[PDB]
Amino acid sequence: MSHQKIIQDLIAWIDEHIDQPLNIDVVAKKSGYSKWYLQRMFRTVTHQTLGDYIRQRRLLLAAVELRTTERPIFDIAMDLGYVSQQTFSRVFRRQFDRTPSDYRHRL
DNA sequence: GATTTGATCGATTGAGCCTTCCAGTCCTTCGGGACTGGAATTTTTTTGTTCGGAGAACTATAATGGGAGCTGTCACGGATGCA
Known part of the structure; x- marks a missing residue:
């Protein structure tokens, strides 16, 4: 192969x-x-x-799982690769120039 | 909920460490799929012998008419062959 x-x-x-x-x-x-x-x-x-x-995609799928559902962010850290929210928001600001909170408010 | 800072798991990758994936070439070795001579075998028809078989003429005192066991009791009738 x-x-x-x-x-x-x-x-x-x-x-x-x-x-x-x-x-x-x-x-x-x-x-x-x-x-x-x-x-x-x-x-x-x-x-x-x-x-x-x-x-990367544990941001990108939390860019739709947070976006569609009413899930708060503090369970995303324990499952999707991290330990606390202070590191999960920082990887977003290097990728797509945004914060997680104002990512949903932009219709 | 948004961010600022210290070090450390992982490993941005860079080289460095080690045999196999598989076309099938070829190999010496050997009984199978080629039909075969030659030697044995067994009938398969063929040849022949011959004992019984079986066909056949002849048998010269004189012998000159059979019945030979039948039919033991149907009776009614429809044409018949006489009359």
Whole structure:
């Protein structure tokens, strides 16, 4: 099996258990690889970060789960990768130049 | 609820550490799928012998008419063949 098939399955791996408390080290058990072999191969194809990749969409899916539902932000930290809200809001201001609170108020 | 700061898990990746994925080439080895001579075997028809079989003429005292066990009791009738 060539390597361009695996990252097609690696992105067919991730988007189904984002509401789960998921990490990179369980991907390496499911893909059988080591913990380090995931992060070299993503740069030949995407030229982005795969360590922050599973952390990017826990903003992007909390950009619709907070947006559609009436969920408050202090349960997003304990499940979607963090421990407190003071770090979750900072990753948003580097990505899309916004704060989480005034992200919904903009119709 | 929005942000400011210290260090540390992870690992931005960079090199550095190690055999297999598999086209099938080829190998010496060997009984199968090619039909075969030659040698054995067994009938399958063929040849022949011969004992019984079986067909056949002849048998010269004189012998000159059978019945031979039948039909033991249906009676009514419809045409018949005489008369």
